[PDB]
Design a protein around this nucleic acid. Sequence first.
RNA 1: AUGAACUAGCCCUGGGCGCUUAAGCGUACUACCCAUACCUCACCGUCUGGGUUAGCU
Length: 40
Amino acid sequence: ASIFAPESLLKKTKAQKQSREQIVAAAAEKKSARQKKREL
RNA sequence: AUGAACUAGCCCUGGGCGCUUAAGCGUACUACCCAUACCUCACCGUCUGGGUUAGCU
């Protein structure tokens, strides 16, 4: 009845989620580190 | 006050037009002119160093 979202797409989306999680965490701590660095 | 001997500089004698308290010579200081040089930018090419695939509307 419906198309089942190909398994290559599911594997990529899981991989992209891992990388997107890393990017946010890296930028989350970068902003705090940059603000302290600017004051120094 | 003069004269003598001297101290040097320049003159006399031995690119063009023109210039002569220079448009000459020497010194000092401002301003100004413009090379394919220098700086900024754009463009060409070469070289060099990267990035780019579960090929993500």
